[PDB]
């Protein structure tokens, strides 16, 4: 649920500065949210390798050197069109003042009855949730022990915790 990240200060900006940064296998990155301007800094490909390339989600505990320490979540990753390599990241600062929308994995935790035959199908892999950062689950369990025939559990027909299902209600989260 938590990740440790640190980064060096970034001063120069533009086409020349960014291209030289990635020549050292670094990534330009910014952090912004709520009060105060943004922070420009540099992280490394090794440092963020397990933050992004992973089926898990974490609340990044970010320590930008020379500026301070904050808490953040992943907001936007910029990938190269051909190499598929990371070229830019922006982290949204999270606080305990107002909720924030994020998408958590949903897990279809046995299957209902004999089941219609190897179906047990997870359709909606992620669900948008807005809440305080310290109320967001690491996972969204579901128990499935009803209507082994043709059935579907919708997004609206579920209540987990002090969450808020903004994930496009009246949709389908599982079927068969």
């Amino acid at each position: 649920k938590t990740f440790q990240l640190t980064g060096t200060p970034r001063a120069e900006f533009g086409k020349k500065a960014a291209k030289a940064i990635r020549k050292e296998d670094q990534i330009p990155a910014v952090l912004y949210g709520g009060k105060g301007e943004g922070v420009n800094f540099i992280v490394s490909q090794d440092a963020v390798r397990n933050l992004i390339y992973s089926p898990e989600i974490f609340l990044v505990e970010l320590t930008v050197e020379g500026s301070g320490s904050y808490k953040a979540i992943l907001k936007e990753i910029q990938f190269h069109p051909v190499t598929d390599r990371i070229i830019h990241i922006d982290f949204l600062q999270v606080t305990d003042e107002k909720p924030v929308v994020m998408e958590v994995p949903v897990v279809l935790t046995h299957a209902e009855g004999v089941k219609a035959g190897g179906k047990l199908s997870l359709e909606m892999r992620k669900l948008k949730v807005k809440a305080l950062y310290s109320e967001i689950p690491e996972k969204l369990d579901i128990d499935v022990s009803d209507l082994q025939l043709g059935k579907t559990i919708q997004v609206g027909e579920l209540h987990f915790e002090g969450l808020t299902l903004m994930n496009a209600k009246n949709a389908v989260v599982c079927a068969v």
């Binding site: 992004i52 390339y53 992973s54 089926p55 990938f79 069109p81 051909v82 598929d84």
Partner: protein
């Protein structure tokens, strides 16, 4: 064959493919795909041959997406016809693509089967390609 149901114009000027693809370079539907490393016109016959090949693999369990549609009309003059006197006889439609554009998306199969199924499809295509896995994928749950 994949072609528009109708068009506003019958002929079209041959354009110019310039840079890397900025749209459709990321997987949205499946977990595995193939992406182009060259710029080229892709014909409907090429696409049908590749799609049949990838669908033949994976038996009957999985879904395949074609993420390009040929909407560009092309012509050809023919033998014994000199230069000039207007445009030639119609010859179907092609889809122009640039490096980075994803062609075939696959989901519903384990990692090894998907890798092999899209290798057979990429061998019917005029461009060299590259296998891509979505970065949120889990190797320990398939």
């Amino acid at each position: 064959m994949l072609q528009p149901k109708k068009t506003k114009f019958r002929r079209q000027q041959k354009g110019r493919m310039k840079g890397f693809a900025q749209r459709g370079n990321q997987l949205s539907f499946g977990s595995f795909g193939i992406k182009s490393l060259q710029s080229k016109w892709i014909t409907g016959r090429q696409i049908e041959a590749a799609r049949i090949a990838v669908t033949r693999y994976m038996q009957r369990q999985g879904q395949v997406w074609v993420r390009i549609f040929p909407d560009k009309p092309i012509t050809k003059k023919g033998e014994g016809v000199r230069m000039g006197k207007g445009k030639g006889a119609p010859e179907g439609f092609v889809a122009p693509i640039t490096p980075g554009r994803i062609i075939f998306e696959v989901e519903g199969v384990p990692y090894e089967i998907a890798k092999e199924a899209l290798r057979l499809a990429a061998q019917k295509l005029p461009v060299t390609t590259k296998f891509v896995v979505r970065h949120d994928y889990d190797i320990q749950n398939q």
